Amino acid sequence: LGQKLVIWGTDVNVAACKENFQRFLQRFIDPLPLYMQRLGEINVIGEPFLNVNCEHIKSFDKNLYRQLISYPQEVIPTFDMAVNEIFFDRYPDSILEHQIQVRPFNALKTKNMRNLNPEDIDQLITISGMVIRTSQLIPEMQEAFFQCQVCAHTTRVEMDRGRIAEPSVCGRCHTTHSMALIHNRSLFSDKQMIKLQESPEDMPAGQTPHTVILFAHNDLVDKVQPGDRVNVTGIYRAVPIRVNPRVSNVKSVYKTHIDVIHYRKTDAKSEKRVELLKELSRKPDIYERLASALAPSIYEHEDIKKGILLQLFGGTRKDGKFRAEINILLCGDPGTSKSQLLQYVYNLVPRGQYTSGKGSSAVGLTAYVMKDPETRQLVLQTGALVLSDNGICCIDEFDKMNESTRSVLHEVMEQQTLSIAKAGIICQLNARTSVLAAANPIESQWNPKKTTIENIQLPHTLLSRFDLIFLLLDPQDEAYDRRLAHHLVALYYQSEEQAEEELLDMAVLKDYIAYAHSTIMPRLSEEASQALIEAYVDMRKIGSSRGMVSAYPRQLESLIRLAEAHAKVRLSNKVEAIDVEEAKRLHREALKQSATDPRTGIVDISILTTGMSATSRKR
Amino acid sequence: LDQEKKIDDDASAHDQLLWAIHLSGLDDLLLFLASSSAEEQWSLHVLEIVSLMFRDQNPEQLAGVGQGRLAQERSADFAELEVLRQREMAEKKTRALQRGNRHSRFGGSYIVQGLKSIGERDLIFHKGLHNLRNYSSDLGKQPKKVPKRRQAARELSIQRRSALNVRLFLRDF
Amino acid sequence: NRELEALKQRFWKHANEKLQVLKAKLQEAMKLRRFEERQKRQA
Amino acid sequence: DEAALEVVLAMYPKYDRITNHIHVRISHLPLVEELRSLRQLHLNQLIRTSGVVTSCTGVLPQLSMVKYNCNKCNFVLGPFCQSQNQEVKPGSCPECQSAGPFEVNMEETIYQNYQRIRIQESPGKVAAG
Amino acid sequence: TRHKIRELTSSRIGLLTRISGQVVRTHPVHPELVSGTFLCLDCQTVIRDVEQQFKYTQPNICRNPVCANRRRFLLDTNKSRFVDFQKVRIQETQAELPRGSIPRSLEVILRAEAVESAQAGDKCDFTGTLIVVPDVSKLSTPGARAEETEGIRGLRALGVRDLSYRLVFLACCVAPTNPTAESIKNQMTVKEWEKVFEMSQDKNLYHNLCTSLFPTIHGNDEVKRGVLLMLFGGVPKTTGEGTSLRGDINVCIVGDPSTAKSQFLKHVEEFSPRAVYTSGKASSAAGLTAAVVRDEESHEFVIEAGALMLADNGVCCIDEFDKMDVRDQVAIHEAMEQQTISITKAGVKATLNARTSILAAANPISGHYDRSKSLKQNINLSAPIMSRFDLFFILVDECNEVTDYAIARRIVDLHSRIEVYSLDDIRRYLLFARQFKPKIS
DNA sequence: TTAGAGAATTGGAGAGTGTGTTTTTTTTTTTTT
Ligand SMILES: [Zn+2]
Ligand SMILES: [Zn+2]
Ligand SMILES: [Zn+2]
C-alpha cells in the first residue's frame, strides 16, 4: 500500500510527495496550468518525457524541491508515477510506447566539477561542461529470457540491481542446471558513456581541466556529440570498482559518475519566411543588397562579395557531368580581410568546411584511413573536400599545401570525386564542392612587378580550374584609407542594436540562400543562349586579331555558371541577358584584377601557361 | 525423437508409410481379412494392424475431414497466429508496466511502515516503486525442486495434424 | 533468325565445384567395370 | 603408405635399414582451388592450391609417438599418438594411479620433423589495391 | 523500409532490418560450427544437432535418459555441420553521415552464400537482424573455460565475473546499394541480340560510333576514330616460348591547353567500365604504377597499387602525361610494353599485372604548339616513351572565327536544348565484339 | 477410513581439492624531401 511508504532513512512520505507534485502540475502557471500544456504536447507529439524546471518546483514548494534534490532516486520515480497518473486520468485512450519520464533540471549549474564532494553522493546536481568523448551504444539487459535445453520450457527473470536470479531448475520438467540464457530473446535498453571536461570559461587560471563520466540511457543516449557544451542535470553516483575482473574484492576508493536525467545544450548559437523572401527577391537591386550584406565587419570589396554570393547560390546541377559548383580564389598579403571572409562564409553556409592548406591543419583536405584510438578498428576519415560534398570548402593558406594535396585538389575540381586507393579500400567518393581559396605571396608582401602565378607559386593547371580570381590589394590613396579608418572606428563603436540588425540581415540571407537551393532551378532562354555564344566569340576576337589567343572554351562554362547563379539570386528561374551581362562584367573584372601583366595588360595565356607572352619572348 | 518435430500438415514417416499402404492396396486386403468369415483366424493380427495405423488420429477430428478443408485450415491458421501474437503483446505490455521506465541500477529504497519484516523491523523494499503496486513476498524467491517421487505425470505426446491426403485416406478407410 | 544464329555461331566459335564432376565421370568408368565383369562371368 | 612399404621391401629387402615408412605423395590432382575460394565444403578433403610462401618456421622436432616417465615409480606410459589438435596429456599411471608432473622420455619417444609455413595468394593473382 | 546506422538501437534487436553502409575491412572466411555432433565418453551414445550459442557449447545432458554424464563429451568434427562465416566492418555512407560527427562503425556478419560478396570500399545494402553478442571470454562452460563499464552478473557459467554485450548486425543478404563468351550470350536478351546484330550490319558504323561516343567534341574526327580503335583493341598472343605479345593499343593526344584533349579522356572514362582517370602528378605515394609503404597495422612494407594496376584489363586515362614523377617515368616503360610492374624493395618482391590500354594527354613545352617543329621537339617525351604509343594526335588551337562560332553553338546547345546510339548499347556491343579474335589473311 | 510408527531413499550442507593472478628508444627503409 503506497501510503505506508517512506524513503529509506528519510522520513518523507512517498504518497504525500506524489500529491504535492500532482498539485504542482495542476496549479503552476507563471513562467513569465503550465504543465498540462506540456502534457498535451506530449499527447500530440508522442515523446515520452516531461521537462520540468527545478526553480519552478522551488518557487511553488520549497520543501518539495529539497526532497527532490536530496532524494532523487525515489522522488523522481514518484514524480513519474504522478505525471503518468495525471496523463492517463486525462487522454484516456491515447497510446504511448512507454510511461512518461519526468526530467527535472536546473536552468544553470548548481555545482562545478572541482567542488564535487562525497557529501553530494546520490544527490541531484547540475554541472556545465564540454564533451570529450561519447562511446558506442551499450545494450543493458532489462529482462533475461531463459529456456530449458532439455524440454524447451521458457521463463523470464527480472533484473535485480544488475544481477540475474538464474533459475537453477526447470518447472515443466525438473532437470537441474538446464535453463540457458537466450541472449537475443532477452530484453535490452540503450546505455552510453560520455566523458565531459569542465568548460574553458570555468577552469581556474593555468590549471589542467577536470573531467567527469556521465552515463545516459534510453532516449538521452543519442542527443550529445563530442565538442558540445552542455548543462547536464543528473544524480551523482558512486560505485565500487573490482581490483581485477575475476575477483570480487573492490577498492576502498570509489569511482563516481553522473546518471543523466536531463541535457541542455548551451552552445547552439516556413511560410512566414517565404512570404518575405518572394517580394524581397523582386525588390530592386536585391543583388547589391545581398552582396553588401555579405561580411559587414570588413571594408568593402564589391566584386569579391558579388563573386562569393554567386558561389553561394551556385548554378544548376543537371545530367552531363558539368559541375554547377563555382570556384573562387582570393590573393593578397597576410593581414588582409581574406581570412575573415573565409571564416564568415564558413559560419554562414550549410555543409561548409574551413581548413588550412598547411600540413598542420586541424582536419585534412585529403581522405585517409586511421585506427580509431578508442576502438582500435579502422575508420575511413574522408577529408574536408568530401565532407563538403554539397557546400563550400574554405581553404586558408592555399599556397602552402604540398604537391600531393595539389594533385588531390586538381582531381576534386576536375572530376568532382576523390579516389581512394587505401590498403584494402577501393572507392570513388563524391566531392561536388565549391572551393573558396585564400592564397598568399611567397614573399612577405605582394610584388607588383611579378604576376599572380609568379607570386603565389601554384601551378597554372590548378589555377585554370578556378572560375574567378580576385586581389585584396589596398591603394596608397587617402580617398580610400580615410573612409576605411572611419569605418574601423565605427566598428569599434558597434553596439548591440547594430549587432541584432546585422544578425537579422545574415539570418534572412541564410534563409534566402536555403530557399533558393530548395526549389529554384534556372534554365536558359534563347536570348541568354545567344548572349553567351556571342560573348565567347567576342572574348576570342581581341586575341585572335593580332595572332595571339585571349579566351578558351572553359571560360564559356564559367560564364554559364555565373549567369545561372545570378538568375538564381534574382529568383527568375529563367536565365536572361541581364544575368549574362552581369556574368560577363564580373568575369572580366576578375580577369582585370588577376590576369593583368604589368606591361601589356590583360593576358589570357598567363593562366594557360606559366609566365606570359613577354616572358616567352624574353627568353 | 530427432525427427518428431515435424509441424502439422506435413508428411511424417508414419504418414508416408500409411500412404505407401494406401497406394499398394494392402489396406483393401486388410478390409478383406477383417470382413472374411473364412479367414477369421487372423482377426487379432488385423486388429493390431488397424490400431497401429490409427495410432495418431482423433475420431471426431478425422470424421470432420472433407473436400473443403484447405481453405478452412488456412484461414484457421492465420486467425490462430494473430490470436497468439495478440496474447504475447498483451503479456509484454503488462511486464513493461510491472517494471519501471528506469534502468535496473537506478537505485532507491523504501520502508513500508505497516509491514513487519521476518523480524520486528519494518520491511525495507529495494525492487523499485513500480513493484509495490502488486507487491508479493515471493518476488525474488527461487521455486523449489519437486522431488522425484512427487513430480507430476506428463502427457506422452503432442498432437499434430497429419498430412491431408493421409487424413482423407484414413477417413475413407 | 538464321543470320542472327550465324552470328551466335561465330561468337561460339571465338568463345573457346569440380569434385562432383570428377566423381560422376569416374562413376561411369566403374559402372563399365561392373558391366564387363558381369558379362565375363555370365559368358 | 602401408602398401607402398610392402612393394618397396619386395623390391629392396634391406631397405628397412634406411626407412621404416614410405610416404605416398599425390601430384596432378584435378581438385584445384583458389585460396580465396576455400569453404567448409572442402573440410577433411584433399585439396590443391597455389600461392607464395610468405613465412616458414625452422625445422622443429614434434612428438609423434610419445612416452612419459611416471612421476614417482620407474614405469613408462604407453605410446600416445600426437594429433596436431591439442597437447597430449598422459592421464594416470596404470601401475600406481599417480597423475603428477609427468615428463617426456626423450630416448624412447619418437619424433618427426615439423615445419609450419604460411602461404598467401600470389601478388599477380590478387586484385590491385 | 531502410534504417540508418544511428537508428540501430536496442529496440531493433531481433527484428528484420535493412541498412546501407560502406565496407571498411573484410576478414578471412572461417568455418563456424552451427550444430555439433558429440559422443558421450562414458556410455558411447551419440548426441546430434547440439545448437550453438555465442560460446562453444556441449550437450547439457546425455541423450541416454539414465546416463548421469553432463560434462564429458567429445565433438565429432567430421559428422558435425559447419557454415561459412565472415565478419566485415562497415561505416555510415557519405550521404547518411550527420554533420560534424565521427563516422559510426558497425560489425556485420555474413554467412554461407553471402561470404566474400562485398569488398572494402563498396557501398552495400545489408538485410538481416541486429543482434547482441556477449563477451564470450567471460563465460566458462564444460566445453571451454573462461579467459570501463560493469556487465550483468549472476549466471552459473559466469561465476563471479560480469557479462558485457556488444551489438552486431547479422546479414542474411548483401547487395550493392545502387548499381566468358557464353556467359555474355546467356546474360543478354533477345532485344539486345537484335541491337547487336543491327550494329554489326550497320553501314557507316565507324563514324556512327565515333559521333555517339563523342557528342560534345566538335571536329577532330580522326582523333575520334583513333580513340574508338583504342577502345576495341587488338588480340593478345603468347609465343611458343611463353613470352607475351602486346594486344592493347596506346594513344597519346598532344595539344594546346585550350583544345579538347582532356575532353576525349573524360568521354572515354565516363563511357567505359573498369576505366581510371588520373593526372600525371600523383595524388598518393603510389602514382601511376605502384609504391611500397609501411603497413600501419603490421609495421611492414606492402604494395600500394597505382592507377595502371587499378586499370588492369581496362583503360587508364592519364591527363597531364608530361608531368610524371621520375619513378613513374621509369616504370611506365615496363608497364606500357611488357604490361607488368616489377618491384624489388625491402620486404616485397612482386610482378604486378598492368594489362592496360593507355590514353595519354599532354601539353607542348612552354604551353603551346609550333607547327614548324616536329612533335619530338614540341613535347618532352623521350624516344623510348614515344615508341610505346601506337597513335599520336596533335591539337592546335586555330584562331578561326567560324570554328569558335560552332564551338559556342555546340556547347550552349548541350547546356540548353539537351536536357544515333546510346552509351549502354555501345557498351553491350563493345563487350560482345571484344570476344572476337580476328585472324590474319 | 485416517493416520502414525519404523525403514529406506533422496536433498543439500559443507568439507576437501585444484587453479590463476601484479608511452619509449634506436634502427632500418621507402618515400619525400
Ligand atoms: Zn525443462
Ligand atoms: Zn607410476
Ligand atoms: Zn551418456
Curated annotation (Swiss-Prot), chain A:
Q: Does the keyword Nucleus apply?
A: yes
- The EC number(s) given in the record are 3.6.4.12
In terms of one coarse class, where is the protein primarily found? nucleus
Q: Where does ATP 2 bind?
A: 299, 338-339, 440
Extra remark: Early fractionation of eukaryotic MCM proteins yielded a variety of dimeric, trimeric and tetrameric complexes with unclear biological significance. Specifically a MCM467 subcomplex is shown to have in vitro helicase activity which is inhibited by the MCM2 subunit. The MCM2-7 hexamer is the proposed physiological active complex.
What does it do? Answer: Acts as a component of the MCM2-7 complex (MCM complex) which is the replicative helicase essential for 'once per cell cycle' DNA replication initiation and elongation in eukaryotic cells. Core component of CDC45-MCM-GINS (CMG) helicase, the molecular machine that unwinds template DNA during replication, and around which the replisome is built.
Q: What is this protein called?
A: DNA replication licensing factor MCM4
The coding gene here is MCM4
From Swiss-Prot, chain B:
Q: What induces it?
A: Regulated by the cell cycle. High levels in S, G(2) and M phases, with highest level in S phase. Low expression in G(0) and G(1) phases.
Q: Which residues carry this modification: Phosphoserine?
A: 109
Query: Which tissues is it found in, per the record?
Result: Expressed in all tissues examined including brain, heart, lung, liver, skeletal muscle, kidney, placenta, pancreas, spleen, thymus and testis. Highest levels of expression in placenta, pancreas, thymus and testis.
Signal peptide span: none
Q: Where in the cell is it found?
A: Nucleus; Chromosome
Q: Which residues form a coiled coil?
A: none
Origin: domain of life = Eukaryota
What disorder is listed for this protein? Advanced sleep phase syndrome, familial, 4: An autosomal dominant disorder characterized by very early sleep onset and offset. Individuals are 'morning larks' with a 4 hours advance of the sleep, temperature and melatonin rhythms.
Task: Tell me the protein family, please.
Answer: Belongs to the timeless family.
Entry domain remark: Residues 1182-1199 comprise a putative nuclear localization signal; nuclear localization is required for the regulation of period length of the circadian clock. The DNA-binding domain (residues 816-954) binds to both single-stranded DNA (ssDNA) and double-stranded DNA (dsDNA), and has high affinity for DNA sequences rich in guanine that form G-quadruplex (G4) structures.
Q: What is this protein called?
A: Protein timeless homolog
Whole-protein coverage range: 173 to 345 of 1208
UniProtKB/Swiss-Prot annotation, chain C:
- Where's it found, cell-wise? Nucleus
Recount the PTM note.
Answer: Phosphorylated. Undergoes ATR-dependent phosphorylation by CHEK1 during activation of DNA replication or damage checkpoints. Phosphorylation by CSNK1G1/CK1 promotes CHEK1 binding. Phosphorylated by CDC7 during DNA replication, phosphorylation inhibits interaction between the acidic patch and N-terminal segments leading to increased binding to DNA and PCNA.
Induction comment: Expression peaks at S/G2 phases of the cell cycle.
Superkingdom per UniProt:
Eukaryota
What's its job? Required for checkpoint mediated cell cycle arrest in response to inhibition of DNA replication or to DNA damage induced by both ionizing and UV irradiation. Adapter protein which binds to BRCA1 and the checkpoint kinase CHEK1 and facilitates the ATR-dependent phosphorylation of both proteins. Also required to maintain normal rates of replication fork progression during unperturbed DNA replication. Binds directly to DNA, with particular affinity for branched or forked molecules and interacts with multiple protein components of the replisome such as the MCM2-7 complex and TIMELESS.
Which family, according to UniProt?
Belongs to the claspin family.
The protein's name:
Claspin
The residues of the intact protein that this chain contains are 525 to 618 of 1339
UniProtKB/Swiss-Prot annotation, chain E:
| Quaternary structure annotation from Swiss-Prot or TrEMBL | Component of the MCM2-7 complex. The complex forms a toroidal hexameric ring with the proposed subunit order MCM2-MCM6-MCM4-MCM7-MCM3-MCM5. Component of the CMG helicase complex, a hexameric ring of related MCM2-7 subunits stabilized by CDC45 and the tetrameric GINS complex. May interact with MCM10. Interacts with TIPIN. Interacts with CDT1. Interacts with MCMBP. Interacts with DDI2.
The note filed under miscellaneous reads: Early fractionation of eukaryotic MCM proteins yielded a variety of dimeric, trimeric and tetrameric complexes with unclear biological significance. Specifically a MCM467 subcomplex is shown to have in vitro helicase activity which is inhibited by the MCM2 subunit. The MCM2-7 hexamer is the proposed physiological active complex.
Q: Name the major location.
A: nucleus
**Where Phosphoserine occurs, residue numbers?**
101
Could you say which protein family the record assigns here? Belongs to the MCM family.
Q: What does this protein do?
A: Acts as a component of the MCM2-7 complex (MCM complex) which is the replicative helicase essential for 'once per cell cycle' DNA replication initiation and elongation in eukaryotic cells. Core component of CDC45-MCM-GINS (CMG) helicase, the molecular machine that unwinds template DNA during replication, and around which the replisome is built.
Organism name: Homo sapiens (Human)
Motif: Arginine finger; annotated at 387-390
Q: Report the EC code(s) recorded for this entry.
A: 3.6.4.12
Q: Which domain of life is it from?
A: Eukaryota
Every MCM domain range: 205-412
- So what does this thing catalyse? ATP + H2O = ADP + phosphate + H(+)
Q: Which residues form the signal peptide?
A: none
The gene that this protein is the product of is MCM6
Residues annotated to bind ATP? 218, 258-262, 363
Single biological process term from Gene Ontology: DNA replication
Phosphothreonine: modified positions:
149
